[PDB]
Symmetry: D2
Subunit: 308 residues, 4 copies
């Protein structure tokens, strides 16, 4: 529900740990989940992009939700990534995730690849919102999907009772507009770490974050500053925060965040093809820049999920 999510400020988009072997590392999950709740994660998004959802099987996403809900045991609310670029597959998975339980909302991306029109997107998300007990949060991101929902289409959807929010990654003009015209019980999250500062100042509810894995504190610190009206501290953190965000996305994500989470001892392991891990030479620069660690280095292989 909107209620479960309402107070969230730092929703983390949780990675999927893997072994050298390509299988999921369910073992590394407990320590990672603890680290997040220790470093100001308000809520967890499961099986999103950062989780390499395109490469997780149906049954693997189900394993992941059980494994994380066991280890979170109710402590923060959760959102499941449910949408694909097929409306029927999205209807089926969400009704299924409604049954499964433990989620405050299903997240549904604007369809990638097939490039639907605004009416197409409207009828898409309506059908997914219609389908299930689980309300929906729309993830609008032309930087990954080419097309986008316009604010007008988005606010058409926001009126659906079962559509409770948006993870918006367009422009701060668009974001301003959405915050300005939102109906009630409708939540506006930036999905851009490097904008979170501006989105919060403008009246957004929060961030659905990658950088929260490795810089959750300084992000907390900046948000508290906005809330406690210390704009000088908030902007100082923001100015030093931007180059970290850029390093975390300087190779295709979640490669940079996994490499940092690997240095930090969390065995995030590699990425499943078609993603490959960050090159060693980038790996050192990145750890230095994002967590001011020193990486004592030593061509790079992505992994496939077991054939068997």
């Amino acid at each position: 529900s909107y209620q479960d999510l309402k107070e969230c400020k730092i929703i983390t988009a949780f990675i999927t740990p893997f072994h050298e072997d390509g299988s999921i590392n369910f073992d590394a999950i407990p320590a990672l989940i603890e680290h997040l709740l220790a470093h100001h994660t308000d809520g967890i998004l499961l099986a999103g992009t950062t989780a390499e959802s395109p490469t997780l099987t149906h049954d693997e996403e189900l394993e992941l939700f059980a494994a994380v809900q066991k280890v979170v045991n109710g402590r923060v609310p959760l959102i499941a990534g449910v949408g694909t670029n097929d409306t029927r597959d999205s209807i089926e998975f969400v009704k299924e995730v409604a049954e499964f339980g433990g989620f405050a909302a299903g997240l549904a991306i604007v369809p990638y690849y097939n490039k639907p029109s605004q009416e197409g997107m409207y009828q898409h998300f309506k059908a997914i919102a219609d389908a299930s007990d689980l309300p929906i949060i729309i993830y609008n991101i032309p930087g990954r999907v080419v097309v986008e929902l316009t604010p007008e289409t988005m606010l058409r959807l926001a009126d659906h009772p079962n559509i409770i929010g948006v993870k918006e990654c367009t422009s701060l003009a668009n974001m301003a507009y959405l915050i300005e015209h939102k109906p009630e019980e409708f939540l506006i999250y930036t999905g851009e770490d490097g904008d979170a500062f501006h989105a919060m100042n403008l009246g957004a509810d929060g961030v659905i974050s990658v950088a929260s894995h490795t810089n959750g504190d300084e992000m907390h610190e900046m948000f508290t500053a906005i809330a406690e009206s210390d704009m000088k501290k908030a902007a100082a953190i923001q100015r030093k925060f931007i180059p970290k965000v850029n390093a975390l996305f300087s190779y295709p994500s979640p490669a940079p965040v996994k490499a940092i989470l690997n240095y930090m001892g969390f065995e995030a392991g590699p990425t499943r093809l078609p993603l490959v891990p960050a090159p060693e030479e980038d790996v050192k620069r990145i750890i230095k820049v994002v967590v001011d660690g020193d990486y004592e280095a030593t061509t790079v292989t992505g992994v496939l999920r077991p054939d068997y």
Copy 2:
């Protein structure tokens, strides 16, 4: 193989006809296909983007491959859409297709959504080309998938002996470079009906077309003018073809092409959500522009959940 496709000039990116209830209209396939082979389709690509592949299940795609192959009967070579943005799935499907047989190649798109690096794209396409008997054509289309293979990575892949060409949708600058440096047994298709004139001029092997569904004849006349060194005529055709291609892509494909095909009697049906058919006011514009037809809210459909 490369042999099988060497000669194709117009390989058509075949639609999937759907019933008003959202099931495949398998009945419409024989008429539609004969119409293609009647209008200078030399080769057919099944379950590409224009087939609404994101919306076709595993089994549906297999059942399309049956229907089409039964009708085609080896009259032209066939290409199966096999790649997705998951490297393992793509491997498992290219094997199942190689096994299925009757395909000269599999088409594998550059991964959408997850935005791999070049090196990621190389490992992806290498693994697919390593998986099976079936040769691979890469589909590079940053207007659909955001990222793109640089020519440089493309040419590295061109060296894999089981990768035999590219459907290239980037720039004519890139397409020139690829023609220039291509190795042996590597086909270069444009995937952009609008630029097919330029691509063929520049030395491409042909076009993987949507337009060929409705405008095969004039495409044939242009390619013939081009190969007969009749440029004034090739370019007269190209200059008037541009708006028709434009119209075809003026609501998201394959809406406009189904709306024309429906108008020509072929029962293309509607599109599966998230795509919706072309709006009414637009349908008329589109027919008038593309086929010179006289025609007269919109509802996308779902696959049956039973």
Copy 3:
């Protein structure tokens, strides 16, 4: 100097009122100016883009600088547009302006049309800052001039002791970096009324505004809310200001701003060709959106050739 401008929050990019016959309306200047100083203009930029500088002759610009300075009388500091895309002309004009006196700085745009490299931009701006007593503010606006100063070249220039700031129209990412690494005695203005909220939040020194002509008060209220750490109120103001900025730039500036100023009695007049006034149907939209006014083909004018 830097001193003179340290305190400015709202420096307005002053229009040039024109008569229907295309000569400067010098009569309108006193009323327009008093109106700015009445509405929280802290500093004025004369013969910037909004003044239609491409259309003002050398002597006209000098005569504007007279008129305005006579009216202003040292109540606020002044900035003269001095740079063009020719480095020699810019040098000769910044000297003539330094000589003219009464200006805290000269504004020099990144060269338009000829698309210099970074190194070319450095040599350009260095020579201008070397030429005269008069300090230099750089104007970086790739949406007008195509190329842009990277932050890196910008910070090299920031070190010249006669370059004292930037009117920056690139991205908030760049604007953050510049605030963070700025040396001493270097002012950072946003030139984007739309992003002024974000820029001030991020630690900018203020805005070089068009909107301040018509909406000075609410801009003042926002900047005050911001500096009084009243964010909910700052952002309420910003969220409703965005469409007004949008409207102001909805036909090419300064058409929309003159159309509003005309409606408020100020005789801004039309624009000099190649710019034409806002079309009629648009003028009404614009007034309603920007000032909440109730209003009711278009003709751009030429400077007299006699």
Copy 4:
């Protein structure tokens, strides 16, 4: 007139030679002009971008037209660059260039910097076309000016009796359209060397060229092939032509062309600020790539026109 220009295929956009000193090198002009007419230049454009027109004075452009017409002595037709982003200054210079004589047409760029609307551009070019005996050719180039004339505005203008053509640098779709709907006595030139092949196949009249300075022959060779219907030779030249075009624009033009013209012994000299010459390290790669010369190399300074 349209007649003077009608048969032109390779219009060169002539550089402005300068001394180390910043003054124009009128001495180097004769040899450069000869080289062009020796290497298939059909027509010469004077005082365009390639000529660093933004940095030429009024009186310097007048010197240039006299100096080139003396040395061309009638042999090819000529076009003068007359437009600026001020309509009055453009009216005055063109009426003046009509008086001056020896030009087949005045070239007028879509106004840069002030970003006019379509009506604005329309009224702009109408006024310049109205002003003088010299007909006008429009130079539409958003890559330098941001804005552009749409085909609809452009064809509105093409109907003016005194507007005889366009140097179009947008897309080949746009170019196709213009060739398809042109009125009579209206000429379509690409201003893109790297597209000239495609523009010619599509039915364009010609190219207004930079690369013609240093690769005029191979350009002739490709155009003859199109005309004589040998498409295989034309495309072979095109494919090897593209990387030369890219090197000629790999540093801000006319820096790369001047550096090659400097290696070839023509003393093009440096560029006037804000342009600077090409870096040495780029200078060798460029000469190699464009004219397969070997540059025996030896931080880089742009020059100002004399203060005196």
